[model samples]
Target: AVGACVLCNSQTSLRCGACIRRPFLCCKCCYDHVISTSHKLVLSVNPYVCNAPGCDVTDVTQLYLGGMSYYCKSHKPPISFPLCANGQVFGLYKNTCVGSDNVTDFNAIATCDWTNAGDYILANTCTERLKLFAAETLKATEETFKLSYGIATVREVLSDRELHLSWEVGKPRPPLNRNYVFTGYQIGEYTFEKDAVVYRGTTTYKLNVGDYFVLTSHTVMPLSAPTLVPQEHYVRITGLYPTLNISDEFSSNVANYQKVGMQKYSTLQGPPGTGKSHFAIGLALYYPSARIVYTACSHAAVDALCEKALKYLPIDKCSRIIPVECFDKFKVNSTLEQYVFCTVNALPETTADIVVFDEISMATNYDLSVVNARLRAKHYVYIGDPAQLPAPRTLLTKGTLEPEYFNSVCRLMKTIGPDMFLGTCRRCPAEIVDTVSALVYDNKLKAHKDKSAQCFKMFYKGVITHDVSSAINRPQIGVVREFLTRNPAWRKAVFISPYNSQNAVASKILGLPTQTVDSSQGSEYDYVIFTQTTETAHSCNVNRFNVAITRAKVGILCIMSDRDLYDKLQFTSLEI
Candidate 1:
């Protein structure tokens, strides 16, 4: 008998026989009935595939929507509607445009943040996940440059349900919004072509498989439902490790947290290449018997944590709690491939003894606060370099957008003093180290003494730079091809910038691995080709450039106006 589980409403089930003569119960509920009422029931296990595209979950315990459609916790239909950036709706779920119109159908309950764009929307559920743009935009020229990159072709359909797309880089793209995300409209003129199947890479920091597409009208997209990363930062259910009392002294330094055992609040201020991941892993090893729940701001960061954990600890023991959409999003040959990777939306089932947060510097106060109120960790170890990238400032509203890059690490530093990871700069290229230190870290960063050409036989000296060609006002396309040829060994060189368009251009032109200074957090490279993408205010952030330069271990090729770049870095006086 085929019947949906009334309890979970996600999966189909067998006949309970007691609940009704017709089909009713599933194993999850059947067991409960047998234990509670001692009913001898025999039913088989059957599961249903989730409705969301790219998702492969077939748990029998899925929430049943209707007409055999079921959704997992991660992709359950949202109660409220998903509105587009330019004020529109998917209409698939009777979604509301909110603030634009207070409709009787699927209206929202949120703190009204009225801005020029529209109403401020706080996410209510994971299903609120939608990436859409209105039919029109304020910046109409964006799509013009998007096509210049190339029309996206469905090269390969990913197993995880994402599309692998490609475009031509023969002509360099003109200046476009680097941080903007775009949507793929249908290519046909028919009304049927209006429906969109998937989204292009939205965030500049993490460019997904697909690039921009053509024939289909596109819209600027904002990411929906926060991306969930996974971990080695939780488990064991061991006894408590800290021996401090709050009455003696609370909100003290990390030494008092460990030595005096005051509050178990600590922070690790890791500069680039300082091995912050190792420090997190060390904490896990230190608490072998305790529950360690380690988390990060991004999926790759958590993947980095899991890879390090696999390198040092037991594999099966480390569980990866991930969003349903991010299953195969990590490394191709991943440590999590064999292990069943596993969210507040990212919350673990059990309370952790020690919660290790990676890249805390890149996290915002609101994000940290949300996780803190839920995870309920006994000891908190925040790991990151505050001198690097700042947290996100913009938030999506039911109808608008706002800015406020709240660096949570900056907030945490107020209460719990940091365990600064200082001295011996190995990853930061020598040519740019002093400038980076003086400009950002108050000249506190020091170059390692006895600098030998360790990463290369002969490293590039004094940093290399080239003024962008007047035709393109950009140097990467032609210069990178020639630069890589100068040293065949530089084939492994990582291209980095501050915007999605910049990296996407590099991805098309050079076909090299591209990253943003923001996304490149807690990562290192032997050599780097850095592009000062634009003089955009956010891209020009001091911490953003600091993370970009500091990722290199040996040498760098900087592409931008040097004087202009330094002028932004220089600070004179500011007094009220």
Candidate 2:
């Protein structure tokens, strides 16, 4: 009653049951007799498990060999061959199969031989995914530090399923020549072993039927046994909020989000002390395999992310994850590491699950161009509090937010879907949050003056804020000297002065580490010094006051010069 679906090779019901019916007359509608055929069995590679001593894996290697052509004039078994699309197989080898020749195979041609390492791998299907190493990095791990690593592309696949990879650790050779050919041999086993597998013996790979591959053994280090870290020691923060919700939204999305080839993006917006950098630290602890790219508008931002990641991610993960300023050139698939950091400009072509962008708003057209260049990123996060201030360079001019920048961001948003907004202010005091929020939102919130003391208390838990508004109207130079002498501890403080070079004068007088605010950039210190002051009750002084007050996390002692003059020159209440 049952038969085969000839084309797809599946099961089906017999149309005609009786042999008595002629080919022309034996219609399933008219005939009732049936014929029987043998049920054929198929064999293939079993998936591998326990890749290294500790890591888990789910796939096994398979190679290809031609099938016998019953209809061909020449009755020879098909030879091992490769398709041109995948080019040359990089590594190939020959071996025996454990169970030889079953009747059915996935390709429906050659049955598998059950070999511990798989069957005769004289041929294989070709794929295009491999990485080349930089000379400097390669040289570091070579048995002899003076040798060069030869690069090879995959060529032909053999019947023995598991790939046999081998390479040399000798002196450098000119391109593609015999000197560059791998001098050693190895047989890769999908099976995991307790000790490091010694794969030094070579095997002959049939020219027609074997897979070619490349292994980055040079980058491999001595296996130090398996070590599992305590889970709580790490912290992970995801900017993709409700995306992790356990409800239907969370269930469906999170599952699909990390599937082999899915793309996701989100943005983190807020000012300092609002937990942007802290988020990156948390993610490192949770998703060790997740490649996170931390980028910023400037070099300082890039370094800040690097410093935090160094502390948060595992030591092994840190070695694999590279941190560099954005805008530098790099290749994708250069290594199979878990994390990498770079400036927005020089993001290497890597397969990171999430890319965190610090100071996103300050990014330039050049930064945008670099972003557009990435065709293979799964997620994105933009971190910055635009209210803190605009791009550092934009301060000198009357430049408004550029439309082009917004347009590019819009394009990214369209690609990533809806994003998550990070809320909660822990840096500034609740009172200062409202005032700062008002300035950020264009006077939308209830406002207050001289909220610096509260803001400092919020940042530096033990620091207090006291104001010296009694003595105003002195020159700027006097204001700088008076504050330094009053706070003898100033000598140990980091004085973040303005870009006008007032810090040099302060350093000479106060004997402190004096740096322009730009030079101090993302750095933190015991204290910050403000040389610019607005007069008492002057709206014009708001900007200067905000700068000085926001820099201190704990207590701040602010000295003012020309406070009365500042108040007199004020033009509008909105300015304050």
Candidate 3:
């Protein structure tokens, strides 16, 4: 009697028999037959309930991924959840789902496990949205708001539209007294809404509970302020803001490379810190079965590649991130054939399915020749910044020499037709990054005034009437060493001088190691204390200058004995 719909007589995906007195209609027919009447619509799956406690929501039209459970639009997930039993809050790590308990700690656990909120916020679909707002808000510096000084405490959530913020400054505050205000930026799980007045002890204004917000200073006049930072500059700032997803340009190139099927070689060229190493590792991740021979000009580069591979890839894939030097150190019982070994001098004895050469600019002519002769992989990936220090000049000579005959310049220089240029710079601070980028790309050297103290220039005032080089050398070393001793964190500093004699002097001065511009090729550090030894501007080679500046991520401290020499070096371009 109640087999099918009265109108269509079809086998129905849904039946509405309980609605009307003579209700014998399918989903489509029942809806059509309602005719503006008060007929409630039911789903094919009966009695769908929302996940929140004591709230049996049955009219749910959609499932929100915020809680990884069903919720009505009005009952959406809370933005900031409690980190501890006492209701302390936190944020998810940048480019990750896990919460950042400590700023430097990468492997910290979830900030809070509130209704699966910790897990939900990690999804790329959700986190990528934060990047959109961050792309706009992180342009200007907030003088008063420093993440290191203290964490922002959320006082109260007044409604779906408002919340209160207070600063708990546990340590000595950095210099600056600027107004703090909300810029309607959503980071992690909290939405920063309108009415951003200066923070006078405690602040209360409109906000949505979704993700936690890292407190940063917002400009007073919102309408006129520059919102969006440039791509390279944006990448320099750490944390959950300025979120990075693989670019469409990068994705397309990767797609094209994959489709070509390893027949031809490919080269990726970009400014330093453009994720060239990341791209190469991605190819390895793509072809897990393929034995990838990943080699670099130095142990540092090889270690960097291996570190990135392990950090970025999954646990099952960690074994594949093996190094040729350390291959024997790993569990010997595990099959060695399954790894993407990091190598320095020698190529793997077994034939590789793919070969990746990193920092190709540092590869010597002999290094290239060995790789060319030894590698049997059909697919090749060469990654480097040409603007950086090139391969050893003794071997770069073209024609008429036995070394030149063996030099694999063809494969080294022009393996791929047009180089894939990665536009972003992820390592150095914005001021340092801008200076290096301008010099390399535009052939223009710029002097940046970073008030945040990222870059420091200390001038030598000591009198050196006779034998100036020797006179200034002792004083310079003593002064630098004393300053670094006060700031013990700077002990990790790399002292670099233009001359070999000065290199030894500064190395002893700091009691830390030193490297010349040429020897330090394909090297990077947190800080670079560049000691100026040459008084003549002509002594400064452009390539060496380029190499020195790009090496430091945090900043550069240039100590010069002569101001005139530094001034002269600034305007002159490095002639090839």
Query: Best-fitting candidate, measured by TM-score?
Result: 1
| Descending-lDDT candidate ranking | 1, 3, 2
lDDT of 3 by residue, 1-576 (tens): 323433344434343322322323443443443322333333333332355677764442332324434454556676522111111111112122222122211011112111232221221112222222111221221222344554445566655444565555665322111212323334222323122312222233344444234445434211111111111212221111211344453464555345324334555665666677678766655564566677776656776676676665543433433432343332322334444545545355455666778886665433544565566555566677656665432211222212111123323333332246666666655666655656555633223333225566666643322232322256666667777867677888898866555665566556778876766765678888876655544124455566776677776676665554354333212111
Q: Which stretches of candidate 3 lie over 4 Å from their true place?
A: 1-263, 313-336, 342-344, 391-418, 443-452, 458-472, 478-492, 535-539, 561-576
Each model's backbone clash number: 23, 66, 10
Residue 106's lDDT within candidate 1 is: 13
Off by over 4 Å in 2: 1-263, 319-335, 392-421, 428-435, 441-474, 489-491, 533-548, 558-576
Candidate numbers sorted by TM-score from highest down: 1, 3, 2
Q: Each prediction's TM-score against the native?
A: 0.50, 0.42, 0.45
The CA lDDT of each predicted structure is 0.47, 0.35, 0.46
The Cα RMSD of model 1 versus the native structure comes to 17.2
Error of 1 at 414 (Å): 6.7
Error of 1 at 61 (Å): 52
The model with the greatest lDDT is: 1
Candidate 2 per-residue lDDT over residues 1-576, each given as its tens digit: 333222222333322211111111111111111111111111112111222344332111112232411111122235733210132111111111111121122111112221211111111111000000111112232333224454322233323432333334353322221112243224331221010111221354443323232323334221111111111211233333322333332232333233212234444444445556766556544344566666665666766776666665654554222332232333332345565555554566555666666665455333544453441445555555444433432111222332122223432333442243344555443444454454443433232233333222111111112222112122444544555566465545565533223443455566666554334434444455544422233212343334344454543433333434223321211110
* Candidate 2: worst-modelled 10 consecutive residues by lDDT: 123-132
